[PDB]
Amino acid sequence: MDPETVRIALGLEERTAAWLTELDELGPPAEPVRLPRGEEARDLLRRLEVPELDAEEIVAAAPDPDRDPALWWLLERTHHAIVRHMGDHRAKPRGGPPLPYEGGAAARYFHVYVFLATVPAVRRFHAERGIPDEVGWETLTQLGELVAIHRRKYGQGGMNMQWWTTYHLRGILYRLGRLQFSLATGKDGTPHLGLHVPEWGGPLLPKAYDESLHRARPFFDRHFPEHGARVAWGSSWMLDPQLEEYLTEDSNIIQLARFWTLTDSAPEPGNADGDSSILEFVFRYNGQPLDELPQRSSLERAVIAHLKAGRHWHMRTGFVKLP
Ligand SMILES: CCCCCCCC(=O)SCCNC(=O)CCNC(=O)[C@H](O)C(C)(C)COP(=O)(O)OP(=O)(O)OC[C@H]1O[C@@H](n2cnc3c(N)ncnc32)[C@H](O)[C@@H]1OP(=O)(O)O
Ligand SMILES: N[C@@H]1[C@@H](O)[C@H](O)[C@@H](CO)O[C@H]1O
């Protein structure tokens, strides 16, 4: 098989040829790709908290080297492209393009198969770094969340956040209770930890937040002592001071943001970039006209109002010192 044949077979944009050539050069992994099957696949998916509806469909559609040779060629090389960067937070998060849905369920669940095929590799890395099993597993369960999110957002099974799953799969991101932390470095190479909030796990309670923060240094200093971060950095819609206009005092976002020191400049009022991000995280926004979107929470009402009024939301960046 060749990258042009693969590209055309799967119906990928000409845009992706460079990626495909790169993968082509890279070749198959030393350890040949293996997909768990049947009840082994069910157990793994269940452990990764993939909802049952999706897990059944994932197993049923599992591709095959002989019947799906283009898709299988990509599966091995995409797996290879991730594992070669195991432990390496300096490499860009390149998970590969999404596959056109005309390839059916195997195409839609492509990056789930990448994730399943890569679990053994990253779990070995976890073991080597002395990471507790429950931490490793808890970290990998975001696969379920992102699978469920695809369904809510689009109407059928899939997982199109493969750029993000490169972090879990390279063992450079760990969920430590309510928050996640990623190995990171600034433009000047100073190590920090990136701080992230997964959807699942309920509201962002001060006490859960605070516990996660207490876990970060001891965890990273024990298992990645070479890193030495003192500070956590976040970029998020939820760091927009403009939220103070709409959210009240019981809002966990309003209380927690107060600890943060913002480091980017106040954005231009007319800049529109942070719009799609807040829309994504609040509504899983999929192009629909704003009046259809639910209005059941103060935040839901807030983000519409603000946009209706011809105003814009921005992503802000800030830091907190790790306790
Ligand atoms: C504060 C630290 C900043 C650190 C930077 C983090 C960097 C990133 O990870 S960027 C991505 C962030 N992740 C997400 O957005 C995940 C999806 N979002 C969520 O699950 C939630 O927003 C979550 C859990 C994080 C916060 O929820 P919660 O603790 O309820 O927020 P809170 O400020 O207390 O809520 C205020 C109101 O808005 C509602 N609300 C909050 N978030 C959402 C949401 N995503 N969708 C709908 N309604 C929401 C609440 O239900 C509450 O409603 P009401 O006043 O009507 O009772
Ligand atoms: N889509 C990702 C989220 O899944 C993640 O929680 C956040 C962390 O800042 O980064 C966003 O771009």
**Domain final position from 172, 190, 218:** 172
Same domain, 158 and 223: no
CATH number reported for the structural domain that contains residue 218 in this entry: 3.40.630.120
- At which residue do the structure tokens 């807030």 appear? 302
CA dist 169 and 112 (Å) reads: 12
Give kind and range of the element (H or E) at residue 217: helix 206-223
**Which residues are 192's β-sheet partners?**
184
Structural domain that includes position 4: 1-172
How many CB atoms lie under 10 A from the CB of residue 269? 9
Contacts of 207 (CB under 8 A, 6+ apart): none
Q: How far is the CA of 196 from the centre of ligand 2 (A)?
A: 6
- Residue 168 Cβ inside 6 Å of ligand 2? The answer reads no
The token pair that represents 40 in the structure block = 């082994």
Tell whether residue 119 is among the known ligand binding residues.
no
- Quote the CA–CA distance of 98 and 12 in Å, as a whole number: 9
Backbone angles phi, psi at 308, to 5 degrees: -55, -45
Asked whether residue 125 falls in the same domain as residue 191, the answer is: no
> Is 252 one of the annotated binding-site residues?
yes
- Please check whether residues 161 and 243 belong to one and the same domain: no
Which amino acid, one-letter code, is at 175?
Answer: R
Question: Measured between alpha carbons, how far is 58 from 184 in angstroms, rounded to an integer?
Answer: 32
Residues 210 and 107 in one domain: no
Asked if residue 126 belongs to a known ligand binding site, the reply is no
Domain match, 36 and 54 both: yes
Q: How far is the C-alpha of 210 from the C-alpha of 250, rounded, in Å?
A: 17
CA 62 to chain centre: 22
CA of 251 to the centre of ligand 1 (A): 9
**Ligand 1 atom nearest residue 297's Cα:** 56
Distances (CA, A) of 44 to 63, 149, 231, 265: 17, 19, 34, 45
Decide: 199 in ligand 1 pocket, CB within 6 A.
yes
Q: Give residue for tokens 């199109």.
A: 160
| Residue 40 DSSP code | H
Is there a binding annotation on residue 298?
yes
Separation of alpha carbons 148 and 60, rounded Å? 17
Report residue 175: phi and psi, to 5°: -90, 120
Is residue 176 left, alpha or beta, with left meaning phi > 0 and alpha meaning psi from -120 to 50?
beta
What distance in Å separates the CA atoms of residue 197 and residue 12, rounded to the nearest whole number? 32
Method: X-ray
Order the strands of the 261-262 sheet from edge to edge. Answer: 173-176, 179-185, 191-196, 231-236, 316-321, 261-262
- 185: number of Cβ within 10 Å: 14
Q: Closest ligand 2 atom, CA of 161?
A: 1
Residues 86, 318: Cα–Cα separation, whole Å = 28
Angle between helices 69-83 and 110-128 (to 10 degrees): 30
Is residue 204 a known part of a binding site?
yes
Residue where one domain finishes, among candidates 122, 147, 172: 172
Distance (Å) from CA 144 to ligand 1 centroid? 19
- Do residue 166 and residue 201 come from a single domain? no
User: CA–CA separation, 26 vs 9, rounded Å?
Assistant: 20
Asked if 181 and 232 touch (Cβ cutoff 8 Å), the reply is yes
With CA atoms as reference, report the closest residue to 176 among 230, 143, 134.
134
Domain boundary among 154, 172, 190: 172
Position in ligand 1 atom list of the atom nearest CA 204: 29
CA-to-CA distance for 17 and 6, rounded, in angstroms?
10
Asked whether residue 154 falls in the same domain as residue 6, the answer is yes
Q: Which residue lies with its CA nearest to atom 53 of ligand 1? A: 297
Please give the Cα distance from 42 to 39 (Å, whole number): 5
Token code pair at residue 138: 């808890």
- On whether both 75 and 182 belong to a single domain, the answer is no
Under 8 Å CB-to-CB from 245, ≥6 apart: which residues? 302, 306
Number of domains observed in the structure of the chain: 2
> Ligand 1: distance of its center to the CA of 272 in Å?
21
- Using CA atoms, how far apart are residues 122 and 104, in angstroms rounded to an integer? 28
CA distances from 166 to 126, 133, 171, 227, 307 (A): 15, 19, 9, 19, 33
DSSP 39: H
Nearest Cα to 282, choosing from 293, 292, 270, 269? Answer: 293
Assess whether the C-beta atom of 29 lies below 6 angstroms from ligand 1.
no
8 Å CB contact between 139 and 146:
no
| DSSP string for 78-113 | HHHHHHTTTT-TTS-----PPPPGGGHHHHHTHHHH
φ/ψ of 197, rounded to 5, equals -120, 105
Q: Cα–Cα distance between 268 and 290 in angstroms, integer?
A: 23
Ligand 2 within 6 A of CB of 196: yes
Helix, strand counts (H, E) of the chain: 14, 6
| C-alpha–C-alpha distance, residues 159 and 311, integer Å | 32
| Co-location of 40 and 50 in the same domain | yes
User: Cα separation of 211 and 15, whole Å?
Assistant: 44
Pocket flag, ligand 2, residue 164 (CB < 6 Å): yes
Quick one: 28 and 149 in the same domain? yes
Residue 313 near residue 242 (C-beta atoms within 8 A): yes
Do 110 and 243 sit in the same domain of this protein? no
From 237, 243, 258, 281, the mutation candidate for ligand 1 (largest count of ligand atoms within 8 A of CB) is: 281
**Cβ contact 174:181 at 8 Å:** yes
Closest residue by Cα to atom 8, ligand 2, is 196
Which residues make Cβ contacts (< 8 Å) with residue 292, sequence separation at least 6? none
Provide the residue type at 302 as one letter.
A
Helices (H), 129-205: 133-140, 142-154, 162-169
134 in the same domain as 11: yes
> Was 251 annotated as part of a binding site?
yes
